[PDB]
Structures are given as structure tokens and as C-alpha cells.
């Protein structure tokens, strides 16, 4: 039965660990956000065909440019992530994540994922951004970034509300089948 290795990359501000925990437990962790998500596998069925989905976190490796690629070989699909309310994380898709993923894994599918969808319409978040002369990342910006990096899909989700969350991992599997 088809085994799938999916690596999750992107800035600390994406909330990679929170994304993966909220997906696998079907719940925002809420009380306390764990820092540790250990390599995970589960059977999910997608378009009928059952599948063994493997999820690796990379939180903690954001500053270790030579250690990060130790996770990259034999990946089936990458999630390249940015936070919809961090413009720096979005630019880093282009400056940092795409270059090294493409360098190590030329022919591996990328899903572009915008996280923290629930914060894009949050007054306090919006104002905190306005005070730095920034706005949240909007849908067309992610579409444009997706095209620029060859991403097979651009998808937006909240770990908090679960909006679009299950779709991210469905589409990661469909990018492989």
C-alpha cells in the first residue's frame, strides 16, 4: 500500500508544528501549543484509494541551512508554507524555501500553503501590520507565488478553525497519485 513522505517547510511564523498537530488530532491544541511533532504516519483514503501518509515537521531547523536538506531526499511531496499575516514569511517562500527544495528535489511536487487564514480578517492583526506599513497576503498574491515556483496548488487554511486544513493534506496526496 502506497507510502507517502510529505515534508512541511517554511518560516517559524507559519506555525508548522501547530498545523500538523491540529490536522492529526482534528483539533487546534488550544491550551498549550506543543513544540514537538514526531514523524507521523496514518492510513487515509483519497478518491477511494487508501494511502499511508507520512508527515515530517522541520520546526527548529529554520537557522541551520545545511541540516534542513538532510530531511529532503526521497520526499514525495512538499508543503512550502507561509503565514497569511506575515509578509516576511511569504517573501521567504521565494528567497529561501523554494530555492533549497528545488535544488535538492527538482522533480518533487510543491503545494503552496497559506496558514493563519483566521487572522487575515482580525482587526488587532491588521492594525499590528498597518503600524509596520504592511497588509495581510491576499488570495491573488498566493496564486501568483504558486505560479512563480511551479506549485501544483495554492491552498489557504486555519489550524484554529480547521478551514481548508483537511484539503491541504488531501491535495498533497493527490499531487502524488
Amino acid at each position: 500500500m502506497q507510502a507517502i513522505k510529505c515534508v512541511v517547510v517554511g518560516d517559524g511564523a507559519v506555525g508548522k508544528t501547530c498545523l500538523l498537530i491540529s490536522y492529526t488530532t482534528n483539533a487546534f491544541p488550544g491550551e498549550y501549543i506543543p513544540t514537538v511533532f514526531d514523524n507521523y504516519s496514518a492510513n487515509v483514503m483519497v478518491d477511494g484509494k487508501p494511502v499511508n501518509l507520512g508527515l515530517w515537521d522541520t520546526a527548529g531547523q529554520e537557522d541551520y541551512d545545511r541540516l534542513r536538506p538532510l530531511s529532503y531526499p526521497q520526499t514525495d511531496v512538499f508543503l512550502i508554507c507561509f503565514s497569511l499575516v506575515s509578509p516576511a514569511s511569504f517573501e521567504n517562500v521565494r528567497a529561501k524555501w523554494y530555492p533549497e527544495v528545488r535544488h535538492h528535489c527538482p522533480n518533487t511536487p510543491i503545494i503552496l500553503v497559506g496558514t493563519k487564514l483566521d487572522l487575515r480578517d482580525d482587526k488587532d492583526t491588521i492594525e499590528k501590520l498597518k503600524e509596520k506599513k504592511l497588509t495581510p497576503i491576499t488570495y491573488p498574491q498566493g496564486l501568483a507565488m504558486a505560479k512563480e515556483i511551479g506549485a501544483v496548488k495554492y491552498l489557504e487554511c486555519s489550524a484554529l478553525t480547521q478551514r481548508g486544513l483537511k484539503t491541504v493534506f488531501d491535495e498533497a496526496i493527490r499531487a502524488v497519485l
Binding site: 506543543p34 513544540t35 514523524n39 531547523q61 537557522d63 541551512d65 545545511r66 541540516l67 538532510l70 530531511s71
Partner: protein, 179 residues
């Protein structure tokens, strides 16, 4: 409360890391050193390259580090000192990281499905590759847990600063040692 959640996670994930390395050594490694199964000429007597110094890393965590972390369970604000005390032991992650590419190519180019057969036979969710990335994950994770304790410990909290310093230095030294 938050410093207690972080300490609990530190300990629970330390226990899991020890169980993980133990499983890797007593399945994937034991099958190579055992003499119970036929070893691809590609990898014969190259367990040194495949597993690097993971035995020595496991011995540190299993003999020393988990027992000493446990003694700091009720002293989360002091746990940075645990990392200062044992700083020299963490140097073996430099050796481990340096070797890991050679490990991965050897398994790719020369192992065929030896380890996949072992995985299936033992019924393991994790591949040899999943197990062998774990030391790289663990050694970059301690600094995240110490940063979390810093957001919620008084300033009787240079017993975190120095610990974090060490646990930033080790992964940077390991990073800087790669080709």
C-alpha cells in the same frame, strides 16, 4: 502552568526519543549485526556509515540525560543547567550530522529493500530513514523548548540563557561541519 506544560513535553519527548533510538538499534541495526539474515554486499560491514554514532547518542540519553532531565521535573526554571553540565556529550551530534548524507546515499545506492523488508517484518510505522533523521530533529528542538521556558520564567532565568546558548551552539557547530 506554561513552564510546567513545557517541562512535561521536554520529558515526554525525551522518553519518546530514547524509545525511538532503542527501536532503531534493536530492529534495523540488530538485523545487520545479528547474523539471522543475508546482507546486501552493497552495505556489508558498513553499519558504521549507516547508523553513524547513534549507539553512543542513545547511550548518553538512555544512561545519563533522561535521568538528569527527570531530576529537574519540579525545577523547570533551572533546566538550562542540565544542558550546561552535559554540553560535551552533545558534541556527538556534530559527528552524527556530518555522517548523515553518506548514510542516506549508502542506503539509497546499495541497500535495495533490505531495511523495507525489516520494517514490514517488524510492523514499524517508521522507516530506517525516519529513525535516522530523529537525532537531527531532537538536537534542533532543545533550543525551541528553552526559548519557550524563557517567555514564562522570571529572571532566575540565566539558568536558561546559558543552556540555550549551548543548545544554539551545538546545532550551529553541526550545521557548520557539513560539506
Amino acid at each position: 502552568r506554561k513552564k510546567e506544560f513545557i517541562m512535561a513535553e521536554l520529558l515526554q519527548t525525551e522518553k519518546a526519543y530514547v524509545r525511538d533510538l532503542h527501536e532503531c538499534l534493536e530492529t534495523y541495526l540488530w538485523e545487520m549485526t545479528s547474523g539471522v539474515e543475508e546482507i546486501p554486499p552493497g552495505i556489508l560491514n558498513k553499519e558504521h556509515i549507516i547508523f553513524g554514532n547513534i549507539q553512543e547518542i542513545y547511550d548518553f540519553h538512555n544512561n545519563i540525560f533522561l535521568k538528569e532531565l527527570e531530576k529537574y521535573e519540579q525545577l523547570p526554571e533551572d533546566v538550562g543547567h542540565c544542558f550546561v553540565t552535559w554540553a560535551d556529550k552533545f558534541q556527538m551530534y556534530v559527528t552524527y550530522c556530518k555522517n548523515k548524507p553518506d548514510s542516506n546515499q549508502l542506503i539509497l545506492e546499495h541497500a535495495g529493500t533490505f531495511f523495507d523488508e525489516i520494517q514490514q517484518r517488524h510492523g514499524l510505522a517508521n522507516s530506517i530513514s525516519s529513525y535516522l533523521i530523529k537525532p537531527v530533529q531532537r538536537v534542533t528542538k532543545y533550543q525551541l523548548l528553552l526559548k519557550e521556558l524563557l517567555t514564562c520564567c522570571e529572571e532566575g532565568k540565566g539558568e536558561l540563557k546559558d543552556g540555550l546558548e549551548v543548545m544554539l551552539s551545538v546545532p550551529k557547530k553541526a550545521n557548520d561541519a557539513m560539506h
